[PDB]
């Protein structure tokens, strides 16, 4: 049967996307920029959580340091502005999930409960309820108003490197180090379906905006998953690229993946076609292992990628508006077939 | 003798544990009401 599928693949054509170039670089923090998150209501400013613990807010247009925020103690591993209500959630290895209010620039409510240094926060899009999960191997669910944990989605057998809150029945996509991913009947307190198509730490996951799917990463492979049924959608061509740290998808089906190699990958989300590799640069003084993109996100526009690299740099990427199907095409896509996943 | 951390205290057990019903300091209701955006 393989030959049929392969033939079908060759028949189809992954569309051309404009490639990328390093538009802006910001040596802002004094640590790794492990978290980056961008305001989805206005597309004006984006904040980034350092290892220093001082999450700093950055205007896009200028690029300048809008303002620092330092309520945490340990590395702010993740943050998440809620477009729904003006609350910047964040989270550190100090186990706090502090909710800032940007109408005041202070912190408002802490969410105590988490046993171990929480790695990720995701706010629920259609509720006043937020999801968080860390080394505890538990994806908790906080009612914001009342600042209690409502429910605790036990299941995972190992730390839980990412999480994504969606509006549907599978309200949580929990991506763990346990070489799994879970979709949850949140109301039930049960994994509705559990995809496991990963050899290694599933340590970079992203919801697609207008598709209702979620890409996940392993050490190399980068599946993309359709979370209605709880079904696979598409294997990718990430066969030689590094350990994926972050995996932010664009509005226009332009799935990003960030390498521990340092190499910025770039995929057509629909197909899997690796339509640009880009070996990143480090700052003059750095060491060659340090060039590692540890964070990433796209704007509302989708025309600016922001990347929290370990060179203490917040690099930003434009799509080339001078590009065509002849002036910089993709990397001449070819499904390899060598006992492959495609 | 005294050993590094490897497999964290997983909140599976803490979930199956019985409630305490104590009243901690910070769980006292602070900022009851939420804010919202224009939209």
């Amino acid at each position: 049967l393989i030959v049929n599928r392969y033939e079908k693949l060759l028949s189809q054509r992954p569309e051309w996307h404009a490639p990328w170039k390093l538009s802006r670089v910001i040596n802002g923090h004094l640590g790794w920029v492990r978290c980056v998150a961008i305001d989805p209501v206005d597309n004006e400013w984006f904040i980034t959580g350092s290892n220093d613990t001082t999450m700093k807010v950055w205007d896009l247009a200028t690029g300048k340091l809008k303002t620092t925020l330092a309520g945490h103690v340990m590395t702010v591993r993740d943050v998440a502005v809620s477009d729904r209500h003006p609350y910047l959630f964040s989270v550190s290895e100090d186990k706090t999930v502090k909710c800032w209010d940007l109408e005041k620039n202070q912190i408002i409510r802490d969410y105590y409960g988490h046993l171990s240094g929480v790695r990720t926060v995701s706010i629920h899009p259609t509720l006043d309820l937020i999801a968080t999960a860390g080394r505890d191997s538990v994806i908790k669910l906080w009612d914001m108003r009342t600042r209690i944990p409502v429910i605790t989605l036990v299941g995972h057998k190992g730390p839980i490197n990412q999480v994504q809150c969606t509006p549907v029945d599978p309200q949580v996509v929990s991506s763990s180090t346990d070489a799994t991913v879970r979709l949850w009947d949140v109301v039930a307190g049960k994994t509705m379906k559990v995809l496991t198509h990963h050899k290694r730490s599933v340590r970079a996951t992203a919801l697609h905006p207008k598709e209702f799917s979620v890409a996940s990463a392993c050490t190399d492979d980068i599946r993309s998953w359709g979370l209605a049924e709880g079904s696979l959608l598409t294997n990718f061509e990430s066969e030689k690229t590094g350990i994926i740290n972050t995996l932010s998808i664009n509005q226009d089906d332009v799935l990003f993946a960030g390498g521990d190699n340092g190499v910025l990958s770039f995929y057509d989300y629909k197909s899997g076609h690796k339509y640009q590799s880009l070996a990143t640069r480090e700052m003059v003084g750095s060491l060659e292992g340090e060039r590692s993109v540890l964070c990433s996100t796209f704007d509302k526009t989708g025309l600016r990628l922001i990347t929290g690299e370990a060179d203490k740099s917040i690099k930003i990427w434009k799509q080339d508006e001078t590009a065509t199907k002849e002036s910089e095409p993709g990397l001449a896509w070819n499904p390899n077939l060598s006992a492959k996943r495609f | 003798s005294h050993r590094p951390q490897l497999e964290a205290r997983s909140g599976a057990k803490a979930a199956a544990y019985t409630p305490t019903g104590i009243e901690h300091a910070r769980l006292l209701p602070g900022h009851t009401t939420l804010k919202y955006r224009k939209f």
Partner: peptide, 29 residues
């Protein structure tokens, strides 16, 4: 990189001095 179109910025201080909010309180007049 002093030559290239990559525009580097070694920022330090805040523009808005932790008073000017990041989002503004919408209201009646």
């Amino acid at each position: 990189e002093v030559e290239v179109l990559m525009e580097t910025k070694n920022t330090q201080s805040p523009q808005t001095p932790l008073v000017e909010p990041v989002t503004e309180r919408t209201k009646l007049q």
